[PDB]
Every structure is written in C-alpha cells, then in structure tokens.
Design a protein around this nucleic acid. Sequence first.
DNA 1: CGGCAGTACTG
DNA 2: CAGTACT
DNA 3: GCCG
Length: 325
Amino acid sequence: WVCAQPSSQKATNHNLHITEKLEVLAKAYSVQGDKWRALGYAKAINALKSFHKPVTSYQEACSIPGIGKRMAEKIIEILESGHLRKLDHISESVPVLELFSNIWGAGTKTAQMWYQQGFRSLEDIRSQASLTTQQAIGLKHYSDFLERMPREEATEIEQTVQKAAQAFNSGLLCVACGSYRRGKATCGDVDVLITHPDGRSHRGIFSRLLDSLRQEGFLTDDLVSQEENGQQQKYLGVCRLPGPGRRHRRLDIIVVPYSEFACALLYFTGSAHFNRSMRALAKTKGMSLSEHALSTAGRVLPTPTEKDVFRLLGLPYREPAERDW
DNA sequence: CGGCAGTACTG
DNA sequence: CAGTACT
DNA sequence: GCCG
Ligand SMILES: [Cl-]
Ligand SMILES: [Cl-]
Ligand SMILES: [Mg+2]
Ligand code: NA
Ligand code: NA
Ligand code: NA
C-alpha cells in the first residue's frame, strides 16, 4: 500500500533507466484508452522508483508488489541490452493522440475520433474539428495549461480568492491544497478549499465569490461551474493575476461543510495516486473513503482531522509532503 | 474471474 | 447516459 | 498491466 509509506522513498530512483522506458509505454497505452493496463504500468513504475536498490534479477523483480511476470520480463531485457524492443513498435498514432489529449476537455475517446477523421495537428483541430465549449477554451490556452507556475504565484492566487471570500464573510476558511500543500516548488493549478467553522455559512457563497472575482477581471474563463440551482460543489476555471508577464492559470475551488473538512482536505491534497491507494485500502477494511466522509460499507465515521482518517484505517500519519505518490 | 477510487459537471 | 474531470 |  503506497499510502502506508513515505513518498520520499522515490527521492533516489535506483532504476531510472528502467522507469524512463516504461513511462513511454504507460503513456502510449493511456492515450489509446487502455486505462487498466496503463494503471498497472503506473503502479509498477512507482514500485521501481521507491525500491531501495537497483533491480538485478528476475526473482528480485517478482518479489516487489506491483511487478509480475510480464513486467519482470521487461526489466531483465532493459538490464541485459539497455533497450526495450516494444518502444520501437508503438502505434504510430500515439504522438498525435498525446497532442490532442492535452486539450483540456478532450480525452482518449475524443482524441481517437479526431485522429480517425484525419486530423494530425492543432491547426487541423482549430480549423476543422468540432469542439465543445470546454475544448475551445482548452485549445485557446493549450500552452498555458501545460505550464507549471512557481509556488509563489499559487500563493498570490490563493490570496486573491481568500480576500474576495472573506470580504463578505470574515469567518470563511480558505486553504490551498494539491501540489502546493504537498510542498512542491511548482504547481500545475491552484486548488482552493473553502469552508466555515459554523457548519452552515458555506451555503450560497459560490455565487457571490465568483461574481466578485469576475468583477475585478480575475477569472477569464469558466470550464465547470453549475451556478443554476445553488448546490454547486466545485468551480473549475481560468484566472490571471494583473500586470505584465502574467499567464493564464487553472484554478479549482471547492466549498465544503465543516463536518467534511478533513476528508475534503485529504482528497484535495492528494496526490491522486495516494488517494486511490488509501481508498482501496479502506475498501479492504469494509469502509469507503470519499471527499465527503469515511464510512463503513453505511455509517459515517467521525473524522475531525486528517489524522483521524489515517488512524481509523490503521495507517501511520503522513504529512502532505510525504503523500506525493 | 474480475476489480482496479469515488466522486462532480456537461450535454 | 458516456466522457472528462478533480485529487 | 497487477492482484486477491
Ligand atoms: Cl471524492
Ligand atoms: Cl485537519
Ligand atoms: Mg486542481
Ligand atoms: Na528509491
Ligand atoms: Na510481485
Ligand atoms: Na485533456
């Protein structure tokens, strides 16, 4: 279980020559839609990174959880010949599929459809493809959404959101989560979690917050924002700080009731692989973990803090920086 | 043999 | 619903 | 792809 171990184990990858090759294959399977095969590769790559020494034999490889016969056969090939033959036999569509699936709002199904229809470049997409509203925004920001920002900029973005929220309710609590909270030097987007310790005033805040942030020109486009019925849980969109030298940045906001704060903080801090491992562990123990609660397979268990979730799952606590799986 | 996380929008 | 998205 |  990855969630039972510190992610600092990957700080020194004694198997980088193997993992750099498997990562190419994992991405090729992923963009072609074979998500489960790609997941198996992702987990094997993480196991190889965290392993304490270079892998040198077939029996050694199989002893690692996440590495089976077929993955072991690939390891010994790399060790004996320095090359992996399958990398020379990837489907020729893969580079274009990767290009297309990096449009926000397009996944494997859309990329494969565009490829089938004869498109091969973003010029083809721009001029000839049918784009959803979201995908047209993704394309307009194609380069910017592949950039990571310095964490100092993420601080500025969180503070912009926080100042706007607290301007109409000074008791609101705002926390930047994701890779920022895990201590990374750069961040792909800014994840802001908002709650209120009174357990009630979090309701009806999205409408005022978003209009405030629109009034000052901070939000430049919206991707996901269900503002019609008042039950909105998340906002996914695009922002840009004022002044020269600023790029458009992805911004994700969730508003949660205080009773769900610890589970929401755990979820939104990630990493994604950390969450999937913790949720899988919960299932083996007759429980279920979501952004809303830790439950039995059910009864909601009391989790006032992140530490309580770890404890109820029988896991030693990990600080956010040690969840970077 | 079948799961592989669990959830929130969009149209 | 399927697709894509969040961590 | 891996695992129970
Ligand atoms: Cl969730
Ligand atoms: Cl906490
Ligand atoms: Mg985000
Ligand atoms: Na290691
Ligand atoms: Na194994
Ligand atoms: Na995409």
